Structure formats: structure tokens, C-alpha cells
A paper describes a structure:
The Delta and Kappa variants of SARS-CoV-2 co-emerged in India in late 2020, with the Delta variant underlying the resurgence of COVID-19, even in countries with high vaccination rates. Herein, we report cryo-electron microscopy (cryo-EM) structures of Delta and Kappa variant S protein trimers – both in the unbound state and in complex with the ACE2 receptor – to gain insight into how their mutations underlie changes in ACE2 binding and antibody neutralisation escape. Within the receptor-binding domain (RBD) of the S protein, both the Kappa and Delta variants share an identical substitutional mutation (L452R) with the previously emerged variants of interest B.1.427/429 (Epsilon). Finally, the P681R mutation (present in all B.1.617 lineages) immediately precedes the furin cleavage consensus sequence (682-RRSR/SVA-688), with initial reports suggesting that the P681R mutation enhances cleavage, and consequently S protein post-fusion transition.
Residue numbers in the entry:
A (entry chain C), B (entry chain F), C (entry chain E), D (entry chain A), E (entry chain D), F (entry chain B): 322 to 589
Write the structure that this text describes.
Amino acid sequence: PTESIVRFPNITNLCPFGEVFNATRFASVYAWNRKRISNCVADYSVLYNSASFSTFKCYGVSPTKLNDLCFTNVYADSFVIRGDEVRQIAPGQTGKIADYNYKLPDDFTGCVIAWNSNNLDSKVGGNYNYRYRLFRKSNLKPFERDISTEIYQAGSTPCNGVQGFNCYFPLQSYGFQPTNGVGYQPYRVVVLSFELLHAPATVCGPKKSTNLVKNKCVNFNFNGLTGTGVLTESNKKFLPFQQFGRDIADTTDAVRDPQTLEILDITP
Amino acid sequence: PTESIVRFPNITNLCPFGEVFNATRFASVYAWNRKRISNCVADYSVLYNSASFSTFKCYGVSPTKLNDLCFTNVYADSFVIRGDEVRQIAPGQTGKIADYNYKLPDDFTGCVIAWNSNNLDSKVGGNYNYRYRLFRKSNLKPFERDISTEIYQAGSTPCNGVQGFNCYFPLQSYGFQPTNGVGYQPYRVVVLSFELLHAPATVCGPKKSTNLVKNKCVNFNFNGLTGTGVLTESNKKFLPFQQFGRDIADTTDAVRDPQTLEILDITP
Amino acid sequence: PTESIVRFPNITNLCPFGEVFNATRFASVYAWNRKRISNCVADYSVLYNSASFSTFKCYGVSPTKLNDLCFTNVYADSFVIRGDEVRQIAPGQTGKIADYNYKLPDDFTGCVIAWNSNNLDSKVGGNYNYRYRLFRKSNLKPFERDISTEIYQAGSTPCNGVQGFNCYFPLQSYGFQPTNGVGYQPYRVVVLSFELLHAPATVCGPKKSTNLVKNKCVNFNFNGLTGTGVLTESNKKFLPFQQFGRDIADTTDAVRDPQTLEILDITP
Amino acid sequence: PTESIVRFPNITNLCPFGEVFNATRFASVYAWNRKRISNCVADYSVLYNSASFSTFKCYGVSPTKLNDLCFTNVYADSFVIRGDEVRQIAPGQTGKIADYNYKLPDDFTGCVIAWNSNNLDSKVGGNYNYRYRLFRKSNLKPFERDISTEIYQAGSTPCNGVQGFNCYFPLQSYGFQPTNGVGYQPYRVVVLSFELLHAPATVCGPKKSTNLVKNKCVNFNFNGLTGTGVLTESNKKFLPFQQFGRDIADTTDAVRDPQTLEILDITP
Amino acid sequence: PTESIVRFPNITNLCPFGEVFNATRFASVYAWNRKRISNCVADYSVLYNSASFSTFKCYGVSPTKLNDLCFTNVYADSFVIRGDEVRQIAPGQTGKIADYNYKLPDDFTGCVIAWNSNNLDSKVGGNYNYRYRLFRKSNLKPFERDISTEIYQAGSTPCNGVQGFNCYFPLQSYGFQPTNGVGYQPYRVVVLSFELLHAPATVCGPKKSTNLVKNKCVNFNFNGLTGTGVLTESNKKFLPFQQFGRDIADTTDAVRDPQTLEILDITP
Amino acid sequence: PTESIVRFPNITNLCPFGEVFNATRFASVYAWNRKRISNCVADYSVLYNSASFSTFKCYGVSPTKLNDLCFTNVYADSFVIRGDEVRQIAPGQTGKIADYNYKLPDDFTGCVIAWNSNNLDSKVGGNYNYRYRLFRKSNLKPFERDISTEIYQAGSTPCNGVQGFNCYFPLQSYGFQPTNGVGYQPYRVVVLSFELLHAPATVCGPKKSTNLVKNKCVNFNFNGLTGTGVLTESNKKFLPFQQFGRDIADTTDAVRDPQTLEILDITP
Ligand SMILES: *[C@@H]1O[C@H](CO)[C@@H](O)[C@H](O)[C@H]1NC(C)=O
Ligand SMILES: *[C@@H]1O[C@H](CO)[C@@H](O)[C@H](O)[C@H]1NC(C)=O
Ligand SMILES: *[C@@H]1O[C@H](CO)[C@@H](O)[C@H](O)[C@H]1NC(C)=O
Ligand SMILES: *[C@@H]1O[C@H](CO)[C@@H](O)[C@H](O)[C@H]1NC(C)=O
Ligand SMILES: *[C@@H]1O[C@H](CO)[C@@H](O)[C@H](O)[C@H]1NC(C)=O
Ligand SMILES: *[C@@H]1O[C@H](CO)[C@@H](O)[C@H](O)[C@H]1NC(C)=O
Ligand SMILES: *[C@@H]1O[C@H](CO)[C@@H](O)[C@H](O)[C@H]1NC(C)=O
Ligand SMILES: *[C@@H]1O[C@H](CO)[C@@H](O)[C@H](O)[C@H]1NC(C)=O
Ligand SMILES: *[C@@H]1O[C@H](CO)[C@@H](O)[C@H](O)[C@H]1NC(C)=O
Ligand SMILES: *[C@@H]1O[C@H](CO)[C@@H](O)[C@H](O)[C@H]1NC(C)=O
Ligand SMILES: *[C@@H]1O[C@H](CO)[C@@H](O)[C@H](O)[C@H]1NC(C)=O
Ligand SMILES: *[C@@H]1O[C@H](CO)[C@@H](O)[C@H](O)[C@H]1NC(C)=O
């Protein structure tokens, strides 16, 4: 391996992590706000190295390596919970938030970023505008959003839309005050989930593309696909929707150049 | 009485509470900051209607009735403590902040205003820029300020100005973190002391001044002096430092108007 | 005083304290249940000797001297509150229950009897059927019950009968669990308020009457009217509503006998 | 498998769990009560649906599947402890109850049911009738009790069974009050121990016995012996104690019918 | 008033406060040790200037003035209690220590000293050598001890000297741990009660006497009896047991010398 | 296996564990004290018998088997830390002590022995003599000691050798009170480190040295070399640095007798 060749798509616009994180008002956890992120350079070490997030805990990927990876789509799910419920944003965990408000799948790949928000989300006398769903008949499916407001029937009597004995509203207020304990303290949570599935990659890190060298042994990083081999011209006519190539041994022997749209044969 | 005549003097500028309360940085408790406020208009109801002040304790005045009474001079004292010693900013209270950092007289008149500033004065990894005087050979007198950094000799041996065995540095750091408990979270405290000595009033509130009505039994408030009488015209010989006259009964019977310099005979 | 004479009306049915204290379901604190107790004999010893009432606090009446006094009418107010809200059931106290749910007068005469009911009012998973009023525009008057359920306008926008941002339901659930700490455990509260008017006393204790002794110096207890003097047969005519004979000097001169209906002058 | 066939013995007398769980007074933890349950149909639904059991921790068996299985002998160990020491009733923990009062084996197959009993085991002024062994020479063996009252020597002095300096009574009282916290509140604990040997099962659930359908491929459940097969009429001569039968390869190939005492060959 | 003439008796030996306050082992609170301090000089400002004592509350006298007074006798009561029970050592208090172990009179002239002894009295594995009386039929008279060990019958059944159901041992061990809470460390309490009989005082403070100067208007401190006057030779002879000479105004004008034992007359 | 043989070298002197564990004053954790224990007999059972130690965590070796083995060298480390920071003395653990003060290797062979020291290290007025490094530019490598007192720079502003804004002293005083909780409580930690590497072993347990039995099948522990075989004479030419031989199968077949320096042959 004489050289190393990194080829990423030629994109420059930064996708708004600022509008996800530095928003004035977030949403409640029963109505958590999901933003689609695609076609951007994403500097994850801006979020990592900044001393502002108490929890930057990442599942299925390393937080330091996120600049050196490319994902097809990023989902940013922002909401506000209490501190003791910050642990509940994890696969294979139980609680009110995990069962009824926000559920993470067991194959989750992404990061959970939680930081304290006392000055923004508390008020003397109580901040009651952040509600969590307390009552539901069944647990939530992963990434299912439930915003329905129907009176929960906890007994045998029908409720008919009126709260009362054994008939409760499903949404319950946090009631934040700045004098509250650190467990009952407002924490803003943003969950980044990365689609690593077979698709064209849109969100890529700030790594700079190098020029293409052929007919030599080079390490290569084509759109997040890492390998070592000899890149040459290929007579393989790719159909325009195809990015990779593959053989009977299930090995990537052909890739499409992200920039020049050139099909390169990877001879090992 | 028929109507009330409130006479406040011709003052146009506002009292500078803005850099007292909304400053970017506050000083520490050992170097507690003091601002002298005089000769302006102060609207205390803005501070009273705030939804962020957790503690608004007052002494010698009512927390409702502070705006209508108007004062000689306002001493605004600003410092950052943590939440446990907010009770130590009370008169007669004993503690490390009370004995060694900031001591209030037992006859203190004014209001203590404190609010949590965890999003401002705490950083992830620790904020150590706010210090308190842990050691002093004598307890502080009321309202004295000690910023000396001399090494507190706690043993018999002279160690000559270095930290070591029983040779402690007098200041120590709070060490604020955003994940700390509410006792160990930063609280910005602004003591607002007011003196009520025999002097003409310099700070008075946003209450409007009404026109004079003479020769009729009216309730009057002549710039802090409230009475009932038939405010007739005068022929008195008031020297220009004489705010209000007296008599053999030691009762107020002649007041010179603050807005026109006209002496008025009070007759009940 | 040679002898002691006690005359109480010949009433024999017990007061229904068993219906008050041993009811299966107590109402919520916002809808506290008042029962009027009159025309019976009240045995307060069964309340006092039994050891389950953790809080037994009487105001204006000595708690061990409940039996000898006679009362006109008794009001028993029953409800369920959490453990830290028990101290607010007292004259002159403040809190959410005192302001918005149940306010005692500052001149309150009677007892507060609170006992733990964790077995009867908590189920595993949460008992959400006990609600307290959390939002009100103004504090309650003494002995005033508010069961209104209109949406509380916290902000400047009209609520229009729907819960949402800055519009809250005034009632909030306790959510009792048996694993919750004693601050957050159910306590059943019965407040006995005795009124002592100029009306004839109907609620009298279990003290038994003696025979009347006339023309001799005795110490008498005439239906709660204690005193000492020579009871003599009188020619005074009382009208049927009149029960005793206060003179021009406002001292009791004659008493109507509560059993035989006899007019009895008191000499000293 | 066309259908499911379940054959259980026709025992209809219900197992005495009412005497275990609803006894008027339990025993102290040093003298914990053990009851032998056998030869009855057991209903575990009344334990699971009940909303008073705060702890239902089952080791080795699924708590929902207690109703499904059959056992031979059930050991019910009932006692009263305090809340913080409920966590000591589990296989493999330490503490005063685990070491000196009640030890659970590491191979424990059974459930632990703990519920709060503040209404029944606490008295205002203290309930000191519940004792625990505080001092012992060596830690207890599993399922061993020590009701001995011998004065524990904690020094080097033979003090002849008299309490005093370094000679302590082995048993110490709890002293339960309703105002005490949940760490120091009474919890009644019933430990159910199921033993499953190579023995005929006497403790089973209320699952109904269906009619005998032979010569068809059925799922079958013969007295807890689950499987799938084509049950036919046999010619094997089982001895009366011999319940099922095994082939050369130690697989169940014949069973006796629990109801009609008939030998049925299980061919697959 | 030129110069004071302090005359205190020529007492040679210091009071044994060191043996009381510095003893190795203190007695338990049910069997507290009382020591009679008399015929000596006692420095009380040594105790105050030492900062080891957490509590120094003195009732009926000020702690700083104690070196200036001659008391007739001193009683030193030393015991070990819990921290939360330290407040029970006060005149007019309720609790287990006040009712059953150590009762202070309401007319108390003395000082209460309490210092933490987690270092010397606590021990890992438990120090159960300190016991307190938990059960008694009646409350204690002031300065009364109970060393009885009879079984407290709390039911109808007799006990026959055997512990069991409703029969409890009167004394319960404390169980001191070094890992206990702030209310549960051992505290050693010395109660110094100053007997002030109208007698020759024998416990005097450390004040250097001044030789007698007569026939001039001087201050004097004769045996703690402060006064101002002219001291003259006395014509009358007082009885050998009687020192104070009272007048019609109940003021001493004829005092015996506490060094040369001769009568002196005080005149204005 | 007829006769067990234990051959240890003839080492007479006892190890100085008294001067390490029972030292009067320990060093602080930034300047932790390392003592080299070699060429003595060590009794670790008497370390294990004491119940004063609240943590006796041994990593890689079991505490019961400590007397069995032999070591070449022992590293006895000693320091004082608070109770919450005891857990950071562990392999593969993070914290202030682990990063900045004392780091164990990830594969550590030895025992962490920590006991509470409230009685020895606390004093009234606070013991601030114990300091810990709170600020460092880089994390400590394992078994590396840093005693630098250079002022740590946090901001871009140079410190210039004085304490100030964003320039802190790297060492912080603990502040131990006798009234502190168990979290801030002084704990004395000794970390014994053992090397299991093959060398002439100098420190061994108190096991008795048996005689030499030859030409009989015996168990043997030759300086901690456990095995079973028929120990016969050898003609192998062991050099002085060669202590135990090995065969072509890499098994121990010839061991030098530690007492005699005589070469013996293991034969199974
Ligand atoms: C949010 O704003 C702050 C400004 O104080 C900035 O430092 C931070 O980087 C911003 N975060 C994002 C994600 O843009
Ligand atoms: C950018 O990429 C596109 C294809 O995605 C390609 O057609 C174009 O030539 C590239 N431009 C440059 C300057 O590399
Ligand atoms: C403004 O102030 C001056 C002096 O303070 C006073 O004489 C004058 O009357 C005031 N102006 C008005 C319009 O009253
Ligand atoms: C500080 O700034 C906020 C920003 O809205 C303002 O509402 C508040 O009144 C300011 N405080 C003072 C004392 O002016
Ligand atoms: C409630 O019922 C119990 C039954 O055990 C009884 O002891 C108690 O006296 C009753 N309460 C009243 C107020 O009578
Ligand atoms: C009972 O009281 C009534 C009046 O309330 C009276 O008429 C009647 O005589 C009394 N009974 C007796 C036996 O005195
Ligand atoms: C105990 O009694 C209650 C009374 O309703 C009943 O619901 C419960 O099922 C009983 N417990 C058992 C184990 O049968
Ligand atoms: C019930 O079972 C027994 C054996 O357990 C059997 O002898 C008896 O016949 C059965 N009864 C019926 C009605 O089948
Ligand atoms: C000391 O006191 C005695 C009486 O107790 C007295 O007789 C004697 O004179 C005194 N000593 C002096 C030096 O005055
Ligand atoms: C107890 O001993 C210490 C040790 O020197 C001493 O400082 C203290 O003064 C003594 N206390 C008394 C009352 O003598
Ligand atoms: C420390 O001294 C005590 C004194 O009794 C002794 O028991 C203990 O064994 C000593 N510690 C060690 C580690 O030997
Ligand atoms: C002790 O061991 C040495 C070798 O380590 C040996 O030379 C010496 O003779 C031995 N002494 C005794 C008394 O066994």
C-alpha cells in the first residue's frame, strides 16, 4: 500500500445541527420532534469536543470515529425529559418513557446527547408545558410516535371523554422548577440515528477528497467503504442506480467513483 | 380627605439595575461587588414580577411595599455562592460565608435576591473561577471586605508564604458542574441594602406626580413624608437646606415643595 | 361546695364517628366530605385510646378533655392527602392544600386526625384516583370547597376548553404506590370542627347525669355551663328558646335544667 | 399436531395459600414459619393479579408461568422484616437477616413475595414484638433457623448468661411505627420454594383435563410431562408405582393416564 | 468607685474538671455518673475557648461570666447519647431520654456540654455497650436515675422475668457505627448544675484576690457578691454559720470576710 | 501422594507490615507512599482476620489463598482518600484519582485494602492536610507518581506563576470533618502489588518447612512450586541463576532445593 486515496462526494453545505441543538423551544417526549438530515458535511467532533453536553453516549459506533464515516440518512429526534429518565433512552430498557413515549430498537446505531436545561425549561412557580405520556394500553413499537389524546380506561366503566374515577388523561406534566433536584431537573435530549443500510450515502464527514491514482496498490476509502487494492478501469457497465459491484464470493470488486461517476475494478 | 397629592422630584434617568442583575460575569463572594445607586428612578416591580428569582427575602420592608417607599441610597452587592449558603446571606446567621466571606449586620434593612445560574456559571468538567474565603483568623465585621491572599498559618511554624503543612491558602474553589446537586449549583445573589438616614431622597419609584391643591384638607406625600392637612401658602424663612419644618409639638407643620421650592403650611 | 351535680340532656344514641372514620372510600381533597354531627352522644375516648392515628392535633381544645365539654354542632371533614401535605392542615399554614384545596380558619377550634392508609389507598402500579387542585386564580377562603374543573389560563391566550400550551387542568393526580416514601404515602385526614354558639348544645360527651340537689351549695355542670352556687327553685319564666338567665352584669343568674325543664337561680 | 390434550389428576381441593398470605399475625424472622403444601390444586393467579405485592421476584421460574407448571412440594416461609432488608431475601446477598436470621440457597427455585404491612404491624408508640437475631457466632446455613436465646459473648469474659458489658442478648426488636420511613416500615415476606424431583407431582394448576383422544398426532401434557406424539392403547405391564416409561435411549415412550390409570404408548 | 476589692477564699487545689471531661469510659444515660465538685477553683473559660464542644448551652447564667462567680456546689453528670437526642438535654423537653433516662428541671441553673465522640465510643462491628432505657411506667423526676432491669409488662399477661410477646427488656443498646448518619454518632454530654445555696460558696472561679482596702467608696466582689460601697468595721457579731447580713431592703450590708473571717459593714 | 512436602527458604524475619498499615501519618494521594517488601515472611491471614477493613478486593488472586503462594517482591502503596473515591482504586476504572492521582494497571495482581479512618485523620475545624491532584494536562500512566505543583493553565492566558482566573493550583485539600457523611469520610488505602514473574522468590507465607523425602511419591511445594512426583537426585548442571528446570514439553521437571541448593528431579 503506497498511498491512501479518500473519495467522498463533492458537497460543501453544512446541515443544521445548530437548528437541531440550539433551537429556542423543543418538543415534549410524547410528541418528539424528528428531523431528516441528508446531503451535507457533518462535523460530529463539534458536538463531541464542546464542553456543553453532560451525556454524549453513543451506541453501535464510536463517537470519535464519526467524522470518518458516511451514512445515507440521519434522524435527529429532539425532546425534553427529566434527568432520572435520561437513562431510559437506550435499547433494552424499561420505564414510562421507553414503554409509552420514546422507544429505541435493539439494533440501534447512533448517539444519545443529553444536556441540562435549567435556565431555559424551568420557571419559578412551575413549568408545566412539558408533558409525558403516562397511560397506554400497549408498549410502543420502536420509533413510533403517539400524539393521541383519548381518556385511558383503567377500569370497567366507559370514560366517554370525561376524566374521573378510573378514567385518566394520558398525558402528565413534568412541572419543572429551578429549585428542583438534579434528578427532577430538565434535560434536553437529541438522539441521532444513522441509516447504515444499502443506499446512496448522503451525510459524510469533513474528510477531504484526494486525487484518484490507478494501477497501483493503495488503501482506499470510497464513500465510507474502506479497503486495500488496485483500482483500475473496468468494462463493467453499471446500471445508473447501482453504486457497488459484487461477485459470487460476495466481495466488493467494483465501486463507482463518487465524483467522476467512474466504475473502478478493485483487483486485490 | 378628598384626593391624595403625591409629589416626587423632577428626576428623568433610570437606576442602573441592568448591569447589577444582567451582567455577563459576577464576582466571587470574597471580592463581593458593591455598586452605589443614587439620584434616579428605580422600578422594583420588574424585579418583583420576574419568574427566575427563587429567593426574594426582604428585611425591614415588605416585598410588596418596597416600591412606594423611596430611599436615600441603594447599595447593590453582587456575588456568586452555591445554593446551600443562600440561607447564610441572612442577618444573624453563622457559617463560613457569613463569618469569613460576607457578613450582614443584625439590623440589616433591604432585600436579598438570589437565583440559580447553573447554565451560566457551570461548565462540563468543572468551573473553578469562583472562590470563597475558607480560612480567616477572625470573624468578619458587618459589611467589611477582605481580599487579602496571605497564607493562613494554622500551625506554630512559620512557613513563609507557601502552601503546605498547616499553611493553607485562604481561598478555595466551589468547583461548579452542571450535573451537581441543587445545593452545589451556582446561585447569583444580589443584596439590595437601603439606608433610611436623615437625608433628602435621591431614588424614588415610577409613581407619577399630581398637581397641588391648596387650602383643602388633602392627604399628601411630599417626597417620602406622608400626612394629612390643609396645605396653605406660607411666608416662612426656609434656608435652602431645610426640607421640612417642625414646631414646638415636634410635628411636621411646614414642607417646602420639592418641585417648585414653595413652602406650605400644614394645618390639620 | 358540698356536692357535685352534672346535668346533661337525656340523649342516648352514639354519634356516627364509625361512619366518618371507617368509610371504605374517602373523597379527594378538592372535594372534601363534610358531615354534620348533632343530636347524639359523642365518645371521643375511642378516637384517643386507639393507636393508629399518627397525627392527633387539637387547636383551642385540650385533646384529653374532649369528653366533659358539650358542643352545639360538629363538622367532620374527611379527605386523603400525601404525607408532606399533612402539616398544611393547621391554622395559619400555607401550601398547595392550604391555598387551593382545604383552608382552615385562623380561629379554628377542633382537631385534625390523620392516619396512614397505604394499604387502602395505594395499589402497585399507581393509584391515580386521588386528585388535588393545583391551579387557582386566588387562594381559598376558610371552609370553602371548589370543585370547578375549567381549564386554567396560565398565559395570555384563551384556553377554549382544551388542554395545551399554557392551559392546564386544575386537578392533578397523586399517583400513590406502596413503595413510595412517607412523604408520598396516603394519609386519611378527618378534621373535627366544633362550634360553640349561643344555641343549645346537642353534641355532649359520655358523662352521666346525677340527681339534682337544690337549696344547697353544689358545684354544677349544667349542659356545659360549669359553675358553683346554691341552686334554688325560681319563679322566673323563661321563653322556650331561652336557656339561661344572664343578668345586667353579664353573669349567669339562672339556668334551665336540660332534663326536667326547671328554672334554677344561682346565688353565690 | 392436530390438537392439544391435557390430563391432570382430578384434585379439586384448593391449596392453603389463604392461611399463608392472609394470616392474622406472622412470626419474627428468627423464628420464620414454614408450611408444607402438597396434594392440592394450586391457584397462582390470585398472587399475580393482586395489587398489594410490591415484590414478586421469582428465581428459576418465570413469574407468569407459575400457573403452567406442576411441582411436588411447596415450602412457604412467612416472616416480617423491614424494608431495607427485603433485598437481603435473595440468593447470594449478605446482611444481618441473610447471615444470622434467614439464608436462601444459591440454587433456589422459587419466588419471593413481599408486601407492605404498615397498617397491621405498626403501632403509634412502637411495635416491639418483632425481633431479629443480631448477634451470632457463625453465619446460617440455607433453610436453617435459630430460635435459641443464649447470651452472646462479645469479649473474653465468661459472664454466665447475664446481659451487660460485652454480653448482649441475641435478639433485637424492630420497633415499628407508622411514621417510620419505608426503609424501616414492616414488610411481610412469603418465600415460596418449589422442589421438582423425579417424583409424581402433587401441586398443580387448575388447568382442565380434556377428553382422551387417541390415535392422532397431538400435543400432550400428562401430569406435567409435556410433549408431542400419537398416543395409543398399550400392552405394557407397569408396576403401580411406575408412572411413565422410558425406552433404551432414555426417552419417554409410555405414560400412565393420571385419571383412568391406563398405560398409553407415545409413538411419534 | 476607685478600685475593686475582690476577696475570694484561699483555696489551693484546682477543680477536677479534667477527670470529668477527659475520662476514658463514660456511663450510659440510664445510669449516668454524678460527681460532686466542691472546695476548689474552676476555670470555665478553658472549656469555652476549646472548640471541641459542639454544644455549650447554659441556662440561667451566661457562659462567659462563669469565671467571675462563686457557686456553692457543682454537680457534673456525664453520659453518652445519640446526636438527635442531644436536644433532649434541655429544661422542659420531651422524648425518650428526657422522660425515661435523664430529666432536667425547669428551674435549671447550669450548663449543658455535648461533644462528638465518634472517635472514642464507636467501633466497627458495633459498640453495644451503651444502653438507654426505652420502657418505663412513669416519667422521671428531675435528677433521678433508674438502674432497674425489671421486664416492662406492656400487656395483660405477666412476664415472669422472661422476654417475649408484649414483655420487653427496659434497656436497649444503641448500636454505634462509624458509618452512621450525622444524627447517630455518639455524643458525650456533661451537665454542670450549679448549686447556689445561701451558704459559704466553695467552687470559685480563677480570679486573683486583692488585699482588703477599707474606709473608701470601692467596688467589691465578696464570694461572688458584687457591690459598691464603703467597707467599715462592724459593731455587731454574726453567727458562725451565717455570713450574709440582709437589711430591710433585702440587700447585703454586712458580709463576712472569706479570708480573715471577720465581719465588714457596707454603707452607701 | 503419601506425604506432603513444603520447601520454603529459611527466612527468619517477619515482614514490616506494622510500619505500613499502622503508620501514624499517611501521605496524600498525589504523593502516595511506596514501600518495598522483600526477604521476609509475610502473614496475610492476620490481614484478612481484621474486620476493620471495609474493602479487601484482591484482583487475580483469591484472599484465602494469599498465604499459600510465594512472591519475589511486594509493593505496598499507602494513601488517604474520601469514601466515594475508594472505587476508583481498581484496574480499568476512571475518576479523578485514577486519571490524576493513582492509576492501577489494567492487569494488576494484588489487593486493594481500604479501611475507614475517621478516628485517626479527622479533627474539629477540618483536617485539610490531605490533598489530591485535581488538574492535570494528561492522564497518569499506571504506577507513575506526579508531585508537580505547577499552576495548571485552563484558558489561553498564561498563568505567569500566580493563581488567578483560569489558573488554578493543581492540588485541592479534602476538608475532612468528623461530622461529614460516609461519602466524604477519610479512608486509608493500602494497595499491595505482587509480581507473579518467575525469579528467586523472597517473600513467602508462614507455612512450615518440612523435611526432604526422596524416592517416595510425594506432593511438593518447592518455594511455591506445587506438584506431585517422586523427588530423586539429579545429575543436571544447574547454574546459580537457574532455579527450576524444564523439559522439551515445557514442564517443570527439575527444581533446585531452596534451603540446600541441591538439584532434585521431579518424576511422576
Ligand atoms: C449553539 O450556540 C453556541 C453559542 O453560545 C455555540 O457555541 C454552539 O456551538 C452552538 N451549537 C450548535 C450545535 O450549533
Ligand atoms: C461534482 O460531482 C458531480 C457528480 O456528483 C460531477 O458531475 C461534477 O463534475 C463534480 N464536480 C467537481 C468540481 O468535482
Ligand atoms: C425640573 O426640576 C427643577 C429643579 O429640580 C424644578 O425647579 C422644575 O420645576 C422641574 N420642572 C418641572 C416642569 O416641574
Ligand atoms: C435581563 O434580561 C431579560 C431579557 O428578556 C429581561 O427580561 C430582564 O428584565 C433583564 N433584567 C433586568 C434587571 O433588567
Ligand atoms: C374502625 O373499625 C375498627 C375495627 O377493628 C375499630 O377498632 C375502630 O374503633 C373503628 N373506628 C371507630 C372510630 O370507631
Ligand atoms: C327527658 O328530657 C325531656 C326533655 O328533653 C323531658 O321532658 C323528660 O321528662 C326527660 N325524662 C326524664 C325521665 O326526666
Ligand atoms: C386475602 O384476602 C383478600 C381479601 O379480599 C383477597 O382478595 C386475597 O385474594 C386473599 N389472599 C389470598 C392469597 O387468597
Ligand atoms: C379420579 O382419579 C382417580 C385416580 O387419581 C380415579 O381412580 C377416579 O376414577 C377418577 N374419577 C373419575 C370420575 O374419573
Ligand atoms: C487562709 O484561710 C484561713 C481560714 O480558712 C485563714 O485562717 C488564713 O489566715 C488564710 N490565710 C491567709 C494568708 O490569710
Ligand atoms: C483534656 O485533655 C486535652 C489533651 O491535652 C486537653 O487539651 C484538655 O484541656 C483536657 N480537658 C480538660 C477539661 O482538662
Ligand atoms: C495494628 O495494631 C493493632 C493493635 O492491637 C493490631 O491488632 C493490628 O494487627 C495492627 N495491624 C497490623 C496490620 O498488624
Ligand atoms: C539456610 O539456607 C542457606 C541457603 O539459602 C544455606 O546455605 C544454609 O545452610 C541454611 N541454614 C540453615 C540453618 O538451614
